[PDB]
């Protein structure tokens, strides 16, 4: 499953 570049923002987990 190759990973293409993206204009989507990178996701981060919640900060409590």
């Amino acid at each position, epitope marked *: 499953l190759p990973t*293409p*570049p993206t*204009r*989507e923002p*990178k996701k981060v987990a*919640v*900060v409590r």
Partner: antibody
Amino acid sequence: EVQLQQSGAEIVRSGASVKLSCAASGFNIKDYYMHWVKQRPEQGLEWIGWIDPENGDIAYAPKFQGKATMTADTSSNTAYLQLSRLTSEDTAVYFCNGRGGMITTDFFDYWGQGTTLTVSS
Amino acid sequence: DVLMTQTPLSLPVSLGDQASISCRSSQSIVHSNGNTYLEWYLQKPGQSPKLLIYKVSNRFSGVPDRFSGSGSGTDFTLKISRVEAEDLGVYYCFQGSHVPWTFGGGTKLEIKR
């Protein structure tokens, strides 16, 4: 105050290589995708490449395959762009751009101030 | 490469007036995934570009509602209602759907006198 800070101007001879840096302060680059962009007055803006600093995934514009090498060091919160075999057509301002910090739908987008490269003997 | 062309090249405007800038791609920039990654930037002299609009019509944080993006397929528009002094500079469109991602050549929004 929160920003991407790029390294200072470089003057370099043709055939040499240079490594430009872009350092985050106020955020963690593991939470961002990083992009590099080239700008010249007459040819305009050009996209160089994309990197996910956390896991090292990379993609380059065809025209920069072999010219550009992107890396990142999450421990120092820094991304790098190496340019090899330099010529006058590499004389430009280089910008880094981080996009990320997305918990649900909101996100952050930061640009470095640009680094000027002059290729000349 | 997918070519992004902007018109007009230069747009003189009086403060308070409306401005509209067009961006055309040489072929469709709808991504496989259904999204259209058409973005608009403003760059002021000496500064980096700043994101105004992403995915055709979505205003980035802090961008006032006088900026609006529209379009579909190969034809897009940025409209600025009530131009303010802080809006002056060069506007670029950008497609991030097909690699290599490409920028338009820019449209200079300039003040009349």
